[PDB]
C-alpha cells in the first residue's frame, strides 16, 4: 500500500514549465524547431546543463556556456537583441505554484503520507534570484523533504538519485507514487517498482493520483488557510519594564504588522493569519498580550489599564527598533488598537479592528451607567469582582475553552442574566466545535495553566481609569489609514455598534463577514485573510 | 550639586528649529515680518496651537485652523500656491539630531546624571509622520525620560509642567540644569531655583553647561558607537531541528542582516554594530552561533561540520519566513558566510567577511598537510584532541577572555609553539584591555558557563569533512555582492591571505582597517560601522 508521494517541481508543482519557454521563444522568434532545447541539453551527461544541474557551476556561470551552445546549434542549422539571461529571467518570474497540485500534496500529507519534492535544479546567483527563493520557500514548508539535484550532485534520470530518494523516504519502491512531466525521468522510478504518473494536464494527473491512492483529491471542499505549529515558529521576548516581558511569534519580511488578540485568547488565535500575511509580504508579530501565555501576568488591576498597556506596546516597538507597525486587533486587542491610533499616531502605520467598534467615551455618563444600558454587556459586571470569574473559568480549562470557542449556530452559553455564572446551564463535557480540533483546545489549556484568568480579567477592571484617560481624546479624530471589520453574527460586538464610527474616522474603510460569530479569525479565516491582505496592500504598503 | 540635565527638543537637541522656518518662509515669500509666527501663536493659552501642544487635537486637525489664523493675520495687516502642510512637512524633514548636544547629554548620563527631554510637541498623524517617529526613537533611547506636552496635557511655560518634571526626576530644583532655546520657557525653571541655559549657538551653550557641571563636554575624544544592554534587546528563539535551537538578538526594520560571530565569541561581539546597522535602516539578527550562549550545544563533533551549520542557517531563515538575508561574518562566522554564498546563493542577499579570507580547498592536499605549512595555524592542531583545549579554556573563564580579547599592541598569549597550552607564559590575572570593560568580560564569562568550549571547539574538528564538502564547490564562483574587510594587525588571518580572492569573487569589494587586531568589531567599531553601512547602502539596498 502507498504511503509516500513524490513530486517534481517544474511542470508539476510549478506552472508554466521553464522547459516550455524555449519552444515558445523558438515560435515567437520564428527560429528552427527545437533549436533552443538542443543548445540547452548539448553534450548530454557531460554538457554544461548536467554540470549546472549537479551543482558544479552556478546559473550565472552557465548563461555564457548556453550562449556558446546557441551559437554552435545555429551554425550547424545554417541560420542566425538576443539574450538567454532575459529569456530565463522572464520564464522563472512567470512560473507560479500549481495550486491544485499543492492542494493534492497537502491532502495526502494530512492523511498520513510522507511527501517529497524531487527536482533537477540549479544554484541561482542571478541578481533576481529572490523571486525563486520566495517560491521555493512557500512550497518547501508543505513537504517532509526537498531533494534538489544541485545539492546532492545527482540528477534525474540517474539511478542513484532514485535509490537516494528511497533512502530519505525510508520506503520500498511499491510504497511510492512518483509524479513527473518528463517521461524519461519517470522511467527509472517505474523500473524500481514505483507507481508513476506522467503529468501533462493537472486534472488527469490528479484523477490518476486519486485512483491509485484511494483518496479524494479532485473536487474536494475549499481547504482552510495554512495554520501554525507552535514548535516551528520563531519566538521573541522583550522586557518592557523590570517585572514585565512580552512574548510574540514572528514570521515574514516587510512592513511590521502587530496582531493583538482579545479575551481570553492567545497569539495562537491568529494561527490562520500569520502564514497568509507573511506570504503576502509582511513581517508579522503575533503578540501574547499582557496577562497571557508566555507574556508576564502581574496581579495588580492597574497594570491592565489602557494607558499602561498602550505605553508598554510603544516600549515594545522602541526595544525592537521599530518606528511604526500596523496594528490589527480583535475584541480587547481591537480596543487597544484604536487607542494606539488616538494616543500614538506617529507609531501606528495603519489600524484595523475585527468586531470591536470605536465608540468615544461619554463624558456625561459613568462606564457603569453606560454598561447597564445594554443586556449584552452584563457579563462585564460579573467580571468586576476579583476572584469570582477566575474561580469558574479556571475550574475546568478544557470546558472553559470548549464552551467559549464556538460558531454562531453552536451557542452553548447563556450570556444574558449571568443566574450566577457563565456556565449555569452549560454542559460539563461540551462537544467539540467544528471551528477547533481537540489539539488546538489543549494548546489554549496549556497556555492558561501558567497565569490563569486574573491578568486577562483585569483588562475589564479599569473602566473608570480607562474612561478618564479616553476623555482626553474627545476632541481628536483618527486620520491615519483605518479598517473596521464587522461580523454579522457576533451578538455582543454587533455590526450596528460601528454605525457612527465615520463621525470620528472620516476616511474609515470597511469589511464585513456574513455568518461569522465572535471568534472571527478561526470562524472565517479565509475571508479575514482576503480582507486584511487587500486592505494592507492598498493602505499600509 | 547638579545631578540632572533637562533638554528641550526643537532648537536644542534637534536643528534647525521648526520655529525658524516661519521667519524663513516670511523672508522667502517677502511677507510682513513675524506674520506666520503671529498666526501660529494666535489666541495664546486658548488658541489652536495650545490645544495642539496639550494633545486636545492632532496635527492634521490643527493645519486647517492655522490656515484660518493665516487668513485673519493677513486681513488685519492688509496683504494677500500657499500651503502650511507643505511648509511644515519640509521643516520637520530638515530637522536633524544636534549631534554635539546629544554627545554632551550622553557624557552627563555616563557620569551619573539623570537625563530628560522636556518638549512642547504634537500628536503627528500626517502621512509623513514616520520621519519624526524615527527621529524621536533614535533620540529617546539615550535619555532616562521623555516628557511630551501632548501626552501630559501641560505646556511650557505653565508652572505645573516644571513641578511634574521635578516629580519624575525625583530631584530638587537646585540639582537640575535646564536647557532651552525659548527664553520665556526658561523663566519658570529659573524661578524654582534650577540652573538654566538659553541656547542660541550650541558651542556657547555647551561652554555654559561645561562650567556649571564641572564635566568636560566640549573638545572631548571621539565617543565609541552606541552599544547594547542585553536585558533591553528583543531575544528570538528558533528550533531548527528536535535537539537544536538558535538564539538571536533582533533590532530594527528593513532588509534582514544576519551577523555571524567567530570563536570563542557571542552575539554580543556585534554590540557596537547592532544599534548602528538598525539606525542605518536594516533589520539586524545577531546570532548566537551553534555551540554558543543561549543556542543549543550538542556534544557530537559532526554536529559542527560546515554542511550541517549552513543547512541549519537555511532552516533558521525558513522558520523566520525570510527568503534572504545579507550574511556578515567574522572568523569562523566569516568562513560560514562564504560557504552560505557558495551553496545557498538564492538565500544570500549579499555577503561580507571581517578578517576571514576565502581560500578554496586544495584537492591535492589534506587539510592537516595544508595547516602544517603555516606556523600561525599550529593552534588549530592543539584544538584537535577532544578535551585538551576545553580543560585549559574552561579552567578560568575570566582569565580566558581577558587573555584573548586584547588590542594588537596588548599581546599576552604566545600563539606559536602551543610548550603545551595557550596560557604557557601568560599571567593568571591579566590586566583589563582598553577594548573591554570588566562588565563586558563578565558577560562572556556568564555565557560560557552554560555549555563551555566543547561545541565551539568542534567547529575546528571537522577539517576532513569540511574539505570534502568544499571540493564540491571548486568549479563555482561567488557572483552575488561581496565584501572582504582586512585587519592590518591580525597576525593569524593576515590581510595578505586575501590577495587571490578576486580569482573566485571577480566583483569583490574591499575594506581595510589599519592598527586593527583580530577582534575587529570591538577593536575598531566606528570604522567597521562606516565600512559596513557604506557597503550595505550601495550593494544590499
Ligand atoms: O465605550 C467605551 C468608552 C471607552 C473608553 C476607553 C476604553 Br479602554 C473602552 C471604552 N469603551
Ligand atoms: O474600560 C472601559 C471603559 C469603558 C467605558 C464604557 C464602556 Br460601555 C465600557 C468601558 N470599558
Ligand atoms: O582553506 C580552507 C579550505 C576550507 C574548506 C572548508 C572550510 Br569550512 C574551511 C576551509 N579552509
Ligand atoms: O574545516 C576546515 C577545512 C580546512 C582545510 C584547510 C585548512 Br588550512 C583549514 C580547514 N578547516
- The DSSP code sequence of A246-289 is EEEEEE-SSSEEEEE--TT--GGGGTTTHHHHHHTT-EEEEE--
d(CA A360, CA A363): 9
A124, B320: Cβ pair inside 8 Å?
Answer: no
Residue A175 · residue A2 · CB < 8 Å: yes
Is residue A253 assigned to a domain? yes
DSSP assigned state of B231:
G
CA distance A229 to A106: 15
Give the ligand whose atoms come closest to the C-alpha of residue A497. 1
- Grid coordinates 454579522 are at which residue? A488
* A158 in the same domain as A122: yes
How far, CA to CA in Å, does B424 sit from each of A348, B372, B385, B396, B413? 59, 21, 18, 14, 8
- CA–CA distance, A292 with A282 (Å, rounded to integer): 24
Please tell me the distance from the alpha carbon of residue B378 to that of residue B375, in angstroms, as a whole number. 6
CATH number assigned to the domain comprising residue A328:
3.40.50.1820
Active site residue B344: no
CB contact under 8 A, B133 and A346: yes
CB A480 within 8 A of CB A508: no
Tell me the CA–centroid distance for residue B336 and ligand 4, in Å: 12
- The burial of A376, by beta-carbon neighbours within 10 Å (0-12 exposed, 13-18 middle, 19 or more buried), is given as middle
**Torsion from C-alpha of A418, A420, A421, A426, nearest 10 degrees:** -90
- Does residue B416 carry a catalytic annotation? no
- Cβ–Cβ below 8 Å for B346 and A134: no
For residue B467, the ligand 4 atom closest to its alpha carbon is: 3
CB atoms near residue B389 (< 10 Å):
22
Detail the DSSP E strand segments found in A333-376: 348-354
B162 assigned binding-site residue:
no
- Range of the structural domain that residue B25 is part of: 17-93
Are B371 and B492 contained in the same domain?
yes
Give the domain-ending residue among A214, A243, A271.
A214
> Nearest CA of chain B to the CA of A33: how many Å?
32
Q: Is the Cβ pair A283, B57 closer than 8 Å? A: no
Count of CB atoms situated within 10 Å of the CB of A183: 10
- The reply to whether B406 and B469 lie within a common domain is yes
Q: Are residues A88 and A100 in the same domain?
A: no
Alpha carbon B200 to chain centroid, angstroms: 30
Burial pattern B173-211, b for ≥16 Cβ within 10 A else e, equals bebbbbbbbbeebbebbeebebbbbebeebeebbebbbe
All residues at 6 or more sequence positions from B98 whose CB lies less than 8 Å from its CB, including other chains: B12, B13, B14, B15, B202
- Last residue of some domain: B93, B113, B130? B93
- Domains held by chain B: number: 3
Last residue of a domain, one of B165, B187, B214: B214
Note whether B346 contacts A133, CB cutoff 8 Å: yes
Cα B350 versus chain centre, distance: 20
Say yes or no: B434 and B310 in one domain: yes
Per the CB < 8 A criterion, the answer to whether B152 and B145 are in contact is: no
Contacts 24+ apart (CB under 8 A), A34-39: A35/A70, A35/A73, A35/A74, A35/A77, A35/A79, A36/A70, A38/A73, A39/A66, A39/A69, A39/A70, A39/A72, A39/A73
Residue A225 lies in a domain: no
Non-local (6+) Cβ contacts of A181 within 8 A are A8, A10, A11, A12, A17, A19, A198, A199, A200
Length of chain B (residues): 541
Please tell me whether residues B201 and B160 are part of one structural domain.
Answer: yes
Tell me the HSE value of A367 on the side-chain side, using a 13 A CA sphere. Answer: 19
Domain-embedded: residue A228 = no
B311, B194: one domain: no
Residues B531 and B526: their CA atoms lie apart, in Å, by 9
Cβ within 8 Å of residue A262, ≥6 positions away: A269, A329, A330, A331, A332, A333, A334, A356
**Is B470 touching ligand 3 by the criterion CB < 6 Å?**
yes
Among partner residues A151, A251, A319, which is closest to B232 by beta-carbon distance?
A319
To the nearest whole angstrom, how far is the Cα of A190 from the nearest Cα of chain B? 30
Own/partner pairs, B79-87, CB within 8 angstroms, 24+ separation: B79/B31, B79/B32, B79/B35, B85/B126, B87/B21, B87/B22, B87/B25
> What is the helix (H) or strand (E) element at residue A512, kind and residue range?
strand A509-513
> Which segments of B124-216 are extended strands (E)?
145-148, 176-180, 195-198
Q: Is residue B227 one of the residues assigned to a domain?
A: no
Inter-chain contact A253–B347, Cβ cutoff 8 Å?
no
Which candidate in A331, A490, A523, A539 is catalytic?
A331
Which residues make Cβ contacts (< 8 Å) with residue A411, sequence separation at least 6?
none
Distances (CA, A) of B457 to B65, B311, B333, B340, B468: 68, 19, 13, 21, 20
Q: Is B497 in the pocket of ligand 3 (CB under 6 A)?
A: no
Q: Are B229 and B236 in contact (CB under 8 A)?
A: no
Q: In the annotation, is A201 catalytic? A: no
Which CATH number goes with the domain that contains B70? 1.10.150.240
State the count of interchain CB pairs (< 8 A) between A and B. Answer: 157
Choosing from A367, A383, A461 the residue with most ligand 1 atoms within 8 A of its CB, the one to mutate for a pocket test is A367
Contact between B197 and B189 (Cβ < 8 Å): no
Resolution, Å (one decimal): 1.9
Note whether B337 and B309 are same-domain residues. Answer: yes
> Which of A239, A278, A321 is the closest to B251 by Cβ?
A321
Q: Do A519 and A539 belong to one domain? A: yes
| Whole-number Å distance between alpha carbons of B171 and A270 | 46
Integer Cα distance of B362 and B353 in angstroms: 21
Residue A454 touches chain B, beta carbons under 8 Å: no
Which has the closest alpha carbon to B118: B158, B136, B145?
B145
Q: Please, which residues 297-326 of chain B have a Cβ atom closer than 8 Å to chain A?
A: 318-324
The set of cell numbers assigned to B241 is 531541528
Q: What is the CATH number of the domain that holds B113?
A: 3.40.50.1000
Does the residue B196 lie in any domain? yes
HSE of A300, CA atoms in CB hemisphere, 13 A: 7
Backbone φ, ψ for residue B194 (5° rounding):
-70, 150
CA–CA dist A192, A188 (Å, integer): 6
Domain co-membership, A384 together with A509? yes
B175: part of which helix (H) or strand (E)? none
* Beta-carbon count within 10 A of A362 CB: 15
Residues in Cβ contact with B174 at an 8 Å cutoff, skipping those fewer than 6 apart? B193, B194, B195
Please report which residue ranges of B170-271 form alpha helices under DSSP H: 183-192, 202-213
Whether residue B193 is found in the same domain as residue B239:
no
Q: How far apart are CA A379 and CA A381, in angstroms?
A: 5
Only one residue has cell 584573548, namely B404
Residues of A in contact with B238 (CB under 8 A): 234-235
Q: What is the CA radius of gyration of chain A?
A: 28
Alpha carbon A479 to chain centroid, angstroms = 29
β pairing state of A283-287 and A244-251: antiparallel
Residue A293 DSSP SS3:
coil
Strand pairing class (B244-251; B283-287): antiparallel
Do B496 and B512 share a structural domain?
A: yes
Q: How far apart are CA B452 and CA B408, in angstroms?
A: 26
Q: Which of A473, A444, A451, A447 is nearest to A306 (CA)?
A: A473
Distance B367 CA to ligand 4 centre (A): 5
Q: How far is CA B117 from CA B10, B114, B140, B186, in A?
A: 10, 11, 8, 14
β-strand A482-487 against A509-513: which pairing, if any?
Answer: parallel
Using the Cβ of B251 and the Cβ atoms of chain A, whether some distance falls under 8 Å is answered with: yes
Q: Which of B162, B272, B304, B460 is catalytic?
A: B460
Amino acid at each position: 500500500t502507498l504511503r509516500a508521494a513524490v513530486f517534481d517541481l517544474d511542470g508539476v508543482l510549478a506552472l508554466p514549465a521553464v522547459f516550455g519557454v524555449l519552444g515558445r521563444t523558438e515560435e515567437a522568434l520564428a527560429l528552427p524547431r527545437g533549436l533552443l532545447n538542443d543548445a540547452f541539453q548539448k553534450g548530454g551527461p557531460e554538457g554544461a546543463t548536467t554540470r549546472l544541474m549537479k551543482g558544479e557551476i552556478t546559473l550565472s556561470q552557465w548563461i555564457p556556456l548556453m550562449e556558446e551552445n546557441c551559437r554552435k546549434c545555429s551554425e550547424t542549422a545554417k541560420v542566425c537583441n538576443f539574450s538567454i539571461k532575459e529569456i530565463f529571467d522572464k520564464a522563472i518570474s512567470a512560473r507560479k505554484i500549481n495550486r491544485p497540485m499543492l492542494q493534492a500534496a497537502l491532502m495526502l500529507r494530512k492523511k498520513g503520507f510522507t511527501t517529497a519534492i524531487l527536482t533537477n535544479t540549479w544554484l541561482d546567483d542571478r541578481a533576481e534570484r529572490d523571486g525563486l527563493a520566495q517560491l521555493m520557500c512557500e512550497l518547501k514548508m508543505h513537504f517532509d523533504f526537498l531533494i534538489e539535484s544541485c545539492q546532492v550532485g545527482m540528477v534525474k534520470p540517474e539511478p542513484q538519485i532514485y535509490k537516494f530518494l528511497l533512502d530519505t523516504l525510508k520506503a520500498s519502491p511499491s510504497e511510492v507514487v512518483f509524479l513527473d512531466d518528463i517521461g524519461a525521468n519517470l522511467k527509472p522510478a517505474r523500473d524500481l517498482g514505483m507507481v508513476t504518473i506522467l503529468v501533462q494536464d493537472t486534472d488527469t494527473a490528479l484523477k490518476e493520483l486519486e485512483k491509485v491512492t484511494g483518496i479524494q483529491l479532485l473536487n474536494t471542499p475549499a481547504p482552510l488557510p495554512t495554520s501554525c505549529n507552535p514548535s516551528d515558529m520563531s519566538h521573541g521576548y522583550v522586557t518592557v519594564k523590570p517585572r514585565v516581558r512580552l512574548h510574540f511569534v514572528e514570521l515574514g519580511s516587510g512592513p511590521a504588522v502587530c496582531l493583538c488578540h482579545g479575551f481570553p485568547e492567545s497569539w495562537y488565535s491568529w494561527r490562520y493569519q500569520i502564514p497568509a500575511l507573511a506570504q503576502a509580504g509582511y513581517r508579522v508579530l503575533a503578540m501574547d498580550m499582557k496577562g497571557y501565555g508566555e507574556s508576564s501576568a502581574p496581579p495588580e488591576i492597574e497594570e491592565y489599564c489602557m494607558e499602561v498597556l498602550c505605553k508598554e506596546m510603544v516600549t515594545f516597538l522602541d526595544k525592537l527598533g521599530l518606528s511604526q507597525a500596523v496594528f490589527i486587533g480583535h475584541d480587547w486587542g481591537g480596543m487597544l488598537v484604536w487607542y494606539m491610533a488616538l494616543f500614538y499616531p506617529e507609531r501606528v502605520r495603519a489600524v484595523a479592528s475585527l468586531n470591536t467598534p470605536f465608540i468615544p467615551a461619554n463624558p456625561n455618563m459613568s462606564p457603569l451607567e453606560s454598561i447597564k444600558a445594554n443586556p449584552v454587556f452584563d457579563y462585564q459586571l460579573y467580571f468586576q469582582e476579583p476572584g469570582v470569574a477566575e474561580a469558574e473559568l479556571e475550574q475546568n480549562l478544557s470546558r472553559t475553552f470548549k464552551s467559549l470557542f464556538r460558531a454562531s449556530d453552536e451557542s452553548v452559553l447563556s450570556m444574558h442574566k449571568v443566574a450566577g455564572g457563565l456556565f449555569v446551564n452549560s454542559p460539563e463535557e461540551p462537544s467539540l466545535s467544528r471551528m477547533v480540533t481537540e489539539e488546538e483546545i489543549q494548546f489554549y489549556v496549556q497556555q492558561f495553566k501558567k497565569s490563569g484568568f486574573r491578568g486577562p480579567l483585569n483588562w475589564y477592571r479599569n473602566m473608570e481609569r480607562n474612561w478618564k484617560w479616553a476623555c482626553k481624546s474627545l476632541g481628536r479624530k483618527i486620520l491615519i489609514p483605518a479598517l473596521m471589520v464587522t461580523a454579522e453574527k457576533d451578538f455582543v460586538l454587533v455590526p450596528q455598534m460601528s454605525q457612527h464610527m465615520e463621525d470620528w474616522i472620516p476616511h474609515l474603510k470597511r469589511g464585513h463577514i456574513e455568518d461569522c460569530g465572535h471568534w472571527t479569525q478561526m470562524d472565517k479565516p479565509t475571508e479575514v485573510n482576503q480582507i486584511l491582505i487587500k486592505w494592507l496592500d492598498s493602505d499600509a504598503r
